[PDB]
Amino acid sequence: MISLIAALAVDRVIGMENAMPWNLPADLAWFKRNTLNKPVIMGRHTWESIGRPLPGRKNIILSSQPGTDDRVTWVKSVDEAIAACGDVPEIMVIGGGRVYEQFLPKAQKLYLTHIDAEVEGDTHFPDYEPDDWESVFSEFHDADAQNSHSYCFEILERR
Ligand SMILES: NC(=O)c1ccc[n+]([C@@H]2O[C@H](COP(=O)([O-])OP(=O)(O)OC[C@H]3O[C@@H](n4cnc5c(N)ncnc54)[C@H](OP(=O)(O)O)[C@@H]3O)[C@@H](O)[C@H]2O)c1
Ligand SMILES: Nc1nc(=O)c2nc(CNc3ccc(C(=O)N[C@@H](CCC(=O)O)C(=O)O)cc3)cnc2[nH]1
Ligand SMILES: [Mn+2]
Ligand SMILES: [Mn+2]
Ligand SMILES: [Mn+2]
């Protein structure tokens, strides 16, 4: 099974200048809980944005060019990325925009955080078709002293 996990600001913005400008510790904790002990697939730009391997997960990086760090696994196509995960119950695709576009048609589950924040971005989550997805979990949180925007955790499953 392939799942996508992402945090979306207003208008599906996910990034600006190869960074995420907000800071929502509760959402990073949600990301860790839902990805730990699973393989994670990311594109090369997201690898450079994170800046280090994510511990406790097999890190698989998509790039057309040879890898430059043997602490992670480098692959050259979608099918090779999936194969490099082995026989696991759930593969987590962690972006960025181009990678989400390619894996969305193959995904059965979306883990989405909707952040009530406006930022001027250059990368968006794919327009997906709402009729194709059933919301199976949603949990709203008001802003607090640690999390400066309200946010909504949602899990959607392909109908
Ligand atoms: N808010 C969130 O949830 C979230 C999550 C992840 C990322 N982000 C943000 O998203 C932005 C990065 O997204 P992005 O769309 O620019 O880049 P991306 O999807 O991270 O990376 C694209 C790169 O991945 C490689 N690639 C993708 N598909 C491939 C394929 N089929 N075969 C071979 N290589 C492939 C290519 O690398 P080569 O050029 O080396 O071939 C391509 O240039 C950043 O702003 C980051 O902060 C946000
Ligand atoms: N919901 C969601 N939020 C995100 O921030 C997110 N980020 C990415 C890509 N970028 C990043 C950037 C940093 C870390 C990170 O530092 N993760 C640590 C945090 C642990 C914690 O804060 O408790 C990790 O071990 O996962 C992960 C992904 C992909 N999907 C996401 N999905
Ligand atoms: Mn092929
Ligand atoms: Mn197999
Ligand atoms: Mn706000």
Curated annotation (Swiss-Prot):
Top-rank lineage group of the source organism: Bacteria
Residue stretches making up the DHFR domain: 1-158
Listed CDD domains: DHFR
Effect of M20 to I/V: Increases catalytic rate 2-fold
Catalytic activity entry: (6S)-5,6,7,8-tetrahydrofolate + NADP(+) = 7,8-dihydrofolate + NADPH + H(+)
Keywords: Antibiotic resistance, Methotrexate resistance, NADP, One-carbon metabolism, Oxidoreductase, Trimethoprim resistance
Pathway it works in: Cofactor biosynthesis; tetrahydrofolate biosynthesis; 5,6,7,8-tetrahydrofolate from 7,8-dihydrofolate: step 1/1
Effect of W30G: In strain: 1810
Signal sequence residues: none
Effect after changing M92F: No effect. Increases catalytic rate about 7-fold
Listed GO MF terms: dihydrofolate reductase activity; dihydrofolic acid binding; folic acid binding; methotrexate binding; NADP binding; NADP+ binding; NADPH binding
EC number: 1.5.1.3
Record InterPro entries: DHFR, DHFR-like_dom_sf, DHFR_CS, DHFR_dom
Record annotation: effect of changing L28R: In strain: B[RT500] isozyme 2
Annotated Gene Ontology cellular component terms: cytosol
Binding residues for NADP(+): 7, 13-19, 45-46, 63-64, 76, 95-102
Effect of M20L: Increases catalytic rate 2.5-fold. Increases catalytic rate about 7-fold
Gene3D superfamilies documented for this protein: Dihydrofolate Reductase, subunit A
Gene Ontology BP terms: 10-formyltetrahydrofolate biosynthetic process; dihydrofolate metabolic process; folic acid biosynthetic process; folic acid metabolic process; one-carbon metabolic process; response to antibiotic; response to methotrexate; response to xenobiotic stimulus
Binding, substrate: I5, D27, R52, R57, T113
Pfam families: DHFR_1
Family membership: Belongs to the dihydrofolate reductase family.
Miscellaneous section: The strain K12 sequence is shown. Strain B [RT500] is resistant to 500 micrograms per milliliter of trimethoprim.
Protein purpose: Key enzyme in folate metabolism. Catalyzes an essential reaction for de novo glycine and purine synthesis, and for DNA precursor synthesis.
Protein name, entry field: Dihydrofolate reductase
Organism of provenance: Escherichia coli (strain K12)
Organism placement in taxonomy: Bacteria, Pseudomonadati, Pseudomonadota, Gammaproteobacteria, Enterobacterales
Gene behind the chain: folA
